[PDB]
């Protein structure tokens, strides 16, 4: 009970974002080339997510992020691409390195920042120049449930 969640909040100080993330393959994401028809809009409805990433030509290249309020007066009658809405509003992207402690990015979430965080890790594993690999997404709910479970 309350004890288990005490060990939860105390274990926040050790566990990294990489232990709680969800890989890109399993994340619900939107291509910037999609058009807000009845089908996709309905998918966003029944997605259970209010902030959805918008990528360009590759799940790894996350360009912007679509909030549920952006769809306020959008009608599928006009075949409206979501990229237009992407340049309508400007919600800033929040990035986080894989080995960030959960307490920290928690305090980042509480410090105003968006409840969604794109997770990156440096990849020297190759003879080319180091680069940032996108592992996946981590959200407030992931951490909260990391303490209440």
């Amino acid at each position: 009970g309350p004890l288990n969640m005490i060990q939860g909040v105390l274990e926040l100080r050790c566990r990294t974002v990489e232990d709680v993330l969800t890989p890109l393959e399993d994340c619900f994401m939107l291509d910037a080339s999609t058009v807000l028809d009845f089908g996709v809009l309905a998918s966003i409805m029944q997605s259970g997510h209010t902030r959805i990433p918008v990528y360009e030509e590759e799940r790894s290249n996350i360009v912007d992020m679509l909030y549920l309020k952006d769809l306020a007066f959008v009608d599928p009658e006009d075949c409206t691409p979501l990229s237009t809405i992407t340049r309508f509003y400007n919600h800033p992207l929040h990035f986080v390195f894989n080995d960030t402690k959960l307490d920290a990015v928690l305090e980042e979430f509480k410090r105003g920042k968006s409840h969604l965080a794109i997770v990156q890790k440096v990849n020297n594993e190759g003879e080319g120049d180091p680069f940032y690999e996108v592992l996946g997404l981590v959200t407030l709910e992931d951490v909260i449930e990391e303490i209440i479970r």
Partner: protein
């Protein structure tokens, strides 16, 4: 699976009356904001080290000298290119002391922070202090090859 607009912000390096900026690679739709950052940091000279994936026409229209000096990935710069570097910084640092010169590769964890690292070792700063400075500014700077090259090379040219 890497990003293009998901890299962190460019980093400004100040040392011994010198101002560099390490930044990443843009794309045709982006350069308005990128060169906006360029003019923000006061860069007069941009050195592109990765392949050409953007048009130099806008950035040169804003009044930024751009220099396409590419070499193979993961590798140290050739001696020709480090020559050009050092002399370039002599000229553009002689034209306006305090001007920022910017350099970019795919993402500023490659040849670009290497070149600014050599520029740092030639201005009087130690090797360990240089590399720790750069990757303290943006984490995960260089690979093993670039670091061994960075250690085994000796400075003389002010």
């Amino acid at each position: 699976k890497a990003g293009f607009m998901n890299r962190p912000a460019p980093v400004e390096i100040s040392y011994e009356n010198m101002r560099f900026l390490i930044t990443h690679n843009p794309t045709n739709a982006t350069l308005n904001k990128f060169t906006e950052e360029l003019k923000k940091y006061g860069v007069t000279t941009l050195v592109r080290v990765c392949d050409a994936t953007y048009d130099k026409a806008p950035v040169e229209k804003e009044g930024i000298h751009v220099l396409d000096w590419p070499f193979d990935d993961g590798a140290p710069p050739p001696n020709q290119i480090v020559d050009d570097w050092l002399n370039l910084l002599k000229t553009k640092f002689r034209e306006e002391p305090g001007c920022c010169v910017a350099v970019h590769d795919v993402a500023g964890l490659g040849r670009a922070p290497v070149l600014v690292a050599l520029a740092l070792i030639e201005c009087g700063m130690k090797y360990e202090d240089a590399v720790q400075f750069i990757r303290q500014k943006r984490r995960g700077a260089f690979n093993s090859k670039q670091l061994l090259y960075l250690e085994k090379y000796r400075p003389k040219m002010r």
